[PDB]
Amino acid sequence: GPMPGKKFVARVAEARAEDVGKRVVIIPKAERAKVGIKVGDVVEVKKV
Amino acid sequence: GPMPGKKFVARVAEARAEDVGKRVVIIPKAERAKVGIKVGDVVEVKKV
């Protein structure tokens, strides 16, 4: 596979029934408060 | 709110029915190939 540290850009969404089976990162409320995330916000996801 | 650029660490999961209504980042197959993500992998999410 690729070396670690690569990233992509995405938007935080509200999960719906049609998303069952998709690959997701779940962002709990406490983490949203810490990093300042609202649904609709652009985030960058990096593989560690 | 906070300044942008803060992050938290999480693991990529398969979304289930119990996740409906949660805040998520959906990672499509093409992006998983580009960054080398598998379900179970640790990622870092940053607010832009």
Numbering used by the authors:
A (entry chain A), B (entry chain A): 1 to 48
From the paper:
Phs018 has remarkable sequence similarity to design-1 (26–35% identity), and we replaced five residues in design-1 with the ones at the corresponding positions of Phs018. AlphaFold2 (AF2)19 predicted that the resultant mutant, design-2 (Ph1), would fold into a RIFT-like structure, albeit with a low lDDT region in the 1st β-turn. Circular dichroism (CD) and size exclusion chromatography (SEC) experiments indicated that design-2 was folded (not random coil) and had moderate stability (Tm = 58 °C). Design-2 also formed crystals under similar buffer conditions to the third type of design-1 crystal, including lithium sulfate. By molecular replacement with the predicted design-2 model (RIFT fold) and subsequent manual remodeling, the crystal structures of design-1 (third type of crystal) and design-2 were determined. Surprisingly, they both adopted into a unique β-barrel fold that topologically differs from DPBB and RIFT. The five point-mutations derived from Phs018 (RIFT) in design-2 stabilized the DZBB fold. Furthermore, the addition of five-point mutations in design-2 stabilized the DZBB fold and abolished the capability to adopt the DPBB fold. Most DNA molecules did not migrate from the well when mixed with the proteins with the stable DZBB fold (design-2, -18, and -19) and RIFT fold (design-3 and -4), indicating that these proteins formed large aggregates with dsDNA. Design-2 seems to have a higher affinity for dsDNA than design-3, as dsDNA shifted even at lower concentrations of design-2.
